[PDB]
Amino acid sequence: GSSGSSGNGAFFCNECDCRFSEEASLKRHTLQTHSDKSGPSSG
Ligand SMILES: [Zn+2]
16 A cells, blocks of 8 residues: 555554554553564563
């Protein structure tokens, strides 16, 4: 798919499977859901 598409919604989490209408909405999820320090972070 190339630039130009009816209706926004082209942001899907890379780590997990999800969708977000806005970019800001996704970014947050990525952090909250997948905190920068979660994997090696025992807790
Ligand atoms: Zn995610």
